């Protein structure tokens, strides 16, 4: 699995802070959209893109605070996120796009999805953002942790001060061993704790025991829409996963209105880290019948 990032920076402004994409292949189709979630970047997307490339324009931006954006003084909320990547979307002027989301990427993902229905083709996600009604739906063996790093003490000694998300979280979310040199590529945007707001942020922003409420709203809320929505999708799932499990990925796969569900095999919440060649030939494999 490829741990170089061959990819020229490109940069537009956006709300006066300048934010990073990935920008690759041709400008005569519909282009595909990658968003990440947290604590990666567009690194996340590096061995996928090449499967699609050859035949769409790839573009994964680096959501604000993160990766090779701008890191303004903000408090890095959902909305935060939302208004930015609202305004990058407008800022590159795309008109219909084909979205590939994960994690906190998939609830912007599916939160424009479902304010600009006519314009998404199409929707490539896994490990993605539901709610999760009580602490008893949240992974077993993550409730401890997050539940610490719900709290602002607690939470953002282990954040903030000692990188837990990076140093911990993050690896134990690939199956297979990260390597260091991997490692650094997530490592770079916060080198200095002053920088982590985002990634403390966040797990306070899941949808859990109902709060925040305005979050678990908004996810409700775009949940309905991907129920009731005929756009394609394609749902990438692994055992024993994280967010989604198998059991409800093969739940979705029959609920959700025309929806393909793929294994790629043992994976945790980073499936792209486990199973990029699988999930970048199937979206490529997708895109052709779409
Ligand atoms: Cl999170």
């Given at each position: 699995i490829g741990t170089g990032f061959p990819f020229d920076p490109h940069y537009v402004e956006v709300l006066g802070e300048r934010m990073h994409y990935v920008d690759v292949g041709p400008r005569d189709g519909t282009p595909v959209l990658f968003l990440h979630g947290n604590p990666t970047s567009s690194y996340v997307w590096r061995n996928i893109i090449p499967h699609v490339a050859p035949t769409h324009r790839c573009i994964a931006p680096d959501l604000i605070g993160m990766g090779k954006s701008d890191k303004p003084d903000?408090?890095?909320?959902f909305d935060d996120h939302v208004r930015f990547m609202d305004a990058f979307i407008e800022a590159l002027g795309l008109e219909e796009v084909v979205l590939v989301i994960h994690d906190w990427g998939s609830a912007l993902g599916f939160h424009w999805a479902k304010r600009?229905?006519?314009?998404?083709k199409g929707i490539a996600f896994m490990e993605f953002i539901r709610?999760?009604?009580?602490?008893?739906?949240?992974p077993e063996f993550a409730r401890e942790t997050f539940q610490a790093f719900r709290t602002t003490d607690v939470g953002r000694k282990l954040i903030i001060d000692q990188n837990v998300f990076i140093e911990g979280t993050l690896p134990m979310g690939v199956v297979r061993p990260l390597t260091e040199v991997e490692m650094d590529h997530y490592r770079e945007p916060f080198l200095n704790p002053v920088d982590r707001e985002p990634l403390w942020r966040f797990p306070n922003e899941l949808?859990?025991?109902?709060?925040?409420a305005n979050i678990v709203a908004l996810v409700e809320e775009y949940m309905d829409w991907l129920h009731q929505s005929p756009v394609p999708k394609l749902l990438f799932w692994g055992t024993?996963?994280?967010?989604?499990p198998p059991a409800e990925a093969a739940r979705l796969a029959k609920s959700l209105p025309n929806c393909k569900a793929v294994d790629i095999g043992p994976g945790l919440n980073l499936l792209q880290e486990d199973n990029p060649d699988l999930i970048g030939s199937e979206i490529a494999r997708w895109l052709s019948t779409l």
């Open positions: 903000l408090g890095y909320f600009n229905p006519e314009r998404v709610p999760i009604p009580t602490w008893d739906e949240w949808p859990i025991a109902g709060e925040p024993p996963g994280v967010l989604i």
